[PDB]
Amino acid sequence: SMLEVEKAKLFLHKIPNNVPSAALAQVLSGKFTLDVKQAKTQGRYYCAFALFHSSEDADQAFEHIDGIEMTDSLGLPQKVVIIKLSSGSRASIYVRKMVQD
């Protein structure tokens, strides 16, 4: 049942440190909770996990994400989505499913 929790997770990463993690909720739909990981020492980016109630809700939310669909070198489908920052600045963050089976 650990896997069904994991299949309900989206992985948000390459997030610049100037992005407040609460702003990550603006690019996701549905009902989820965000678990933010601390940036490494002298690190510039951080990542977060969005946990939904099921893999179906996670898949539904990932499809709803407004972002460019791409494939990384590992062959994983990922979406590049723009975060509108209150400073008029912006950030590109990457979103993919946690489990790629």
Numbering used by the authors: 308 to 408
The article reads:
In this study, we solved the structure of SDN1, an exonuclease that initiates miRNA degradation by trimming their 3′ ends to generate unmethylated miRNAs that can be further turned over. Arabidopsis SDN1 and SDN2 belong to the DEDD 3′→5′ exonuclease superfamily, characterized by an active core consisting of three separate sequence motifs with four invariant acidic amino acids (DEDD). The Arabidopsis SDN family belongs to the DEDDh subfamily. Our structural and biochemical studies revealed the structural features of SDN1 in substrate recognition and provided insights on how SDN1 uses its DEDDh catalytic domain and the RRM domain cooperatively to degrade free small RNAs and trim miRNAs in miRNA/target RNA duplexes or miRNAs bound by AGO1.
To better understand its structure and function, we conducted crystallographic studies and obtained crystals of the SDN1 CTD (residues 309–409) with mutations in three glutamic acid residues (E329A/E330A/E332A). In the CTD structure, residues 315–409 adopts a βαββαβββ RNA Recognition Motif (RRM) fold, but the N-terminal first α helix (residues 309–314) belongs to the linker connecting the DEDDh and RRM domains. In the SDN1 RRM structure, the six-stranded, antiparallel β sheet forms a positively charged surface and packs against two α-helices. Sequence similarities between SDN1 RRM and other RRM proteins are very low, but two aromatic amino acids that are usually crucial for RNA binding in RRM family members are present in SDN1 RRM (Phe318 in β1 and Phe356 in β3). Mapping all these residues onto the RRM surface reveals that they are mainly located on the antiparallel β sheet (β1, β3, β4, β5, and β6), which is positively charged. Interestingly, NMR titration showed that Phe318 on β1 of SDN1 RRM interacts with RNA, but no large change in chemical shift was observed for Phe356, suggesting that Phe356 may not be involved in RNA binding. Another feature of SDN1 RRM is that its extended β4 and β5 participate in RNA binding (residues Thr378, Asp379, Gly382, and Gln385 detected via NMR titration), whereas most canonical RRMs consist of very short or no β4 and β5. Unlike many RRMs, which exhibit strong substrate binding affinities (in the nM range) and sequence specificities, SDN1 RRM binds RNA weakly in a sequence independent mode. Moreover, canonical RRMs usually fold into a βαββαβ topology, while our structural and NMR titration studies show that SDN1 RRM is composed of a six-stranded antiparallel β sheet with the unconventional extension of β4 and β5, and the two extended β strands are involved in RNA binding. Despite its low RNA binding affinity, the RRM domain is critical to the overall RNA binding affinity and processive enzyme activity of SDN1 by working cooperatively with the DEDDh domain—while the DEDDh domain attacks the 3′ end of an ssRNA, the RRM binds the 5′ region of the RNA.
